[PDB]
Amino acid sequence: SHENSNSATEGSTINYTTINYYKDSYAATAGKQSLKQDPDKFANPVKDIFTEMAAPLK
Amino acid sequence: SHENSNSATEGSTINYTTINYYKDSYAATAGKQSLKQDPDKFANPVKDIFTEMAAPLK
Amino acid sequence: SHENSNSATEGSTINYTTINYYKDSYAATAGKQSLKQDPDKFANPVKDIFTEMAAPLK
Amino acid sequence: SDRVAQLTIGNSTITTQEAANIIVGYGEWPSYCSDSDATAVDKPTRPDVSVNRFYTLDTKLWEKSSKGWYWKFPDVLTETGVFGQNAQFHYLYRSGFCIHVQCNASKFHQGALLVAVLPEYVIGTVAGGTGTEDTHPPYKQTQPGADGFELQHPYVLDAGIPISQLTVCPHQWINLRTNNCATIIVPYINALPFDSALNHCNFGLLVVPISPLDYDQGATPVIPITITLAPMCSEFAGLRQAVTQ
Amino acid sequence: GDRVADVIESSIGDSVSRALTHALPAPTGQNTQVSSHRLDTGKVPALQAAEIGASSNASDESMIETRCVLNSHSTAETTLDSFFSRAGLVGEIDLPLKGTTNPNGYANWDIDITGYAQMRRKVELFTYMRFDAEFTFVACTPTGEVVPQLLQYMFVPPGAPKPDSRESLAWQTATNPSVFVKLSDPPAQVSVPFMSPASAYQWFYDGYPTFGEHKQEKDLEYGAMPNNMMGTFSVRTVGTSKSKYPLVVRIYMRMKHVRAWIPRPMRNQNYLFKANPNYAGNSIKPTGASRTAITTL
Amino acid sequence: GDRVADVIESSIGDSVSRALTHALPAPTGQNTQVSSHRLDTGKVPALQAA
């Protein structure tokens, strides 16, 4: 498709597949996102990580 | 088609051919099933089978 | 087309070209038939044929 | 070869001389659950002897005016052995069954039974007879125990379905001229890999005489019917305190 | 370490289903082969023993004299998709002007196919079923007349707020689906997945859902598995004031991508209630017809 | 033309006499052979069915 990169996700590090007819990509479909996660950004953001078995405070 | 395997028959050992437009495969057509049978599952489920000619009880 | 051979002409020795969308071939178009004839089936069905010039009864 | 049979599982053993071949319900054998189908994470327990053996329930009588019976499995064994005393502790249950039925008679007696296995045999009441009065079946007719429960309207199996079509299930007959027992093996029949053993009742055994018992005086009138059965490939999960019901 | 022998030879831990049988193709009926006369001993296909509980195996070839016949009769229309994928009525929703059922311009319908017996008796041949679906909605006044009116539908899953009125806040449908549609337009029509927690819809549950001392006042929960109650279907006339027109809404189900299990017998007595196999006892009609003499037609 | 199959496999047109037996010579009576005692099961020539 010889359309424009007007969408909001232009610049993200995931891949979509969409369906479109107009030349403006913000009129495209939502589609499928790339399935990823990063819970250590909110659950274990510590500087010096620790091991499961060994106790944290030593 | 770069769609999802959301259908109910995902996991069956038969092959279909269908027509679809939306990304969700439970919106597809019924189609053609694979033509198979297994009457010995309901008619002759015995452990030790017997021959047509030779009498069963011996 | 991965459709079924449900049509009435399945078994005839002529060739058609048709247009269809549903999986059932009796929903197809009429189309073009093969142009053939056999007037000797109704006009000259005799056992021992005769020649144009030479008279029949001899 | 096809008449004589023997059945050895556990400490126990069964013999029989005038029998028939063995049936496998719905064409396959029991099994333990796969790691793909399963969902629970806890490690089950699998005793393999203390539970997988022949238990004997109760001995009925077959008069001339008899109508039929049923038993619900696996309710029959919830108060019997190390089987039952595991099924009260745990919450999840899986098993198969072998089912053997006895009825003997001489060569002057005549009759025929039908020994069928029906999954999810819900019981339905008569709606007061008139049809309007909504009712429900009591607890002692849905989980009657090991002592069994007798049918009232066997032509419809007490559920609006004929007995004429009960052969499509795993069935056998006991024609007293030919045989004297019926052996049926059944896998675990349910949509879920594990399920409770106290609330849910996966299938029901039926025993209905079609051609009635008959004889002549001077002959033994008491013609009992005994029911024997064995768990197989039994698993358990979800340990906690014992729950009667 | 498994150093004993009864642990090595053990059958425990067998995730395999020993299957005696195995499926085969059959796009056509079987072709009858040729036969001739036989006058032998031992060989005797007619004499069966049905006590075993297996069907016969005698055939036309081994009982009489046949000819060769090349059968081309298909077996494609006896499949399940070709037997079930045919729409039928499953529900009705009334939105009258002034009555007693649903006069305030809204109505809730509990999703349950078991209310009309043409479609119930087809599924009640089987026990466990796994199918997608395709509902279709036909709106009309009682006369069949078509009127310029706007309508809203809203799938209310379990655990969600059921609307209690026409001007409610549950109709914002931010997360629930919905279908606006008019009557001047064609029927509405949408697709449905397999929505259960289980692996199959069982039309027959022999048990109770909960634990407890099952008293007589709580026997109405016999035959109730919540893995089939797939929620509620709401509908209303859009607006702030009442409508000028009565309405009726009919719901049709079409099953596709079907898989079935557990054949079992078929109903012969009239249906009375839902989720309940009860029958009339004083009016047990036979399975079929009757006559006067076994020796005569 | 015999194009059907029930005509090809047909037993019609059999001018042959299927004989189970077949004649043998016998210019003299049979020579009695030697025997000894036997105390076996199964083998039992005396019991016939007429």
Ligand SMILES: Cc1nc(-c2ccc(OCCCCCN3CCN(c4ccnc(N)c4)C3=O)cc2)no1
């Ligand atoms: C927008 C919008 N979406 C929709 C929309 C509305 C409804 C939908 O669910 C359709 C699911 C069909 C459920 C079918 N089953 C399975 C088991 N079962 C019963 C019932 C009662 N008793 C027993 N024993 C079994 C039953 O009835 C999906 C979509 N329409 O509007």
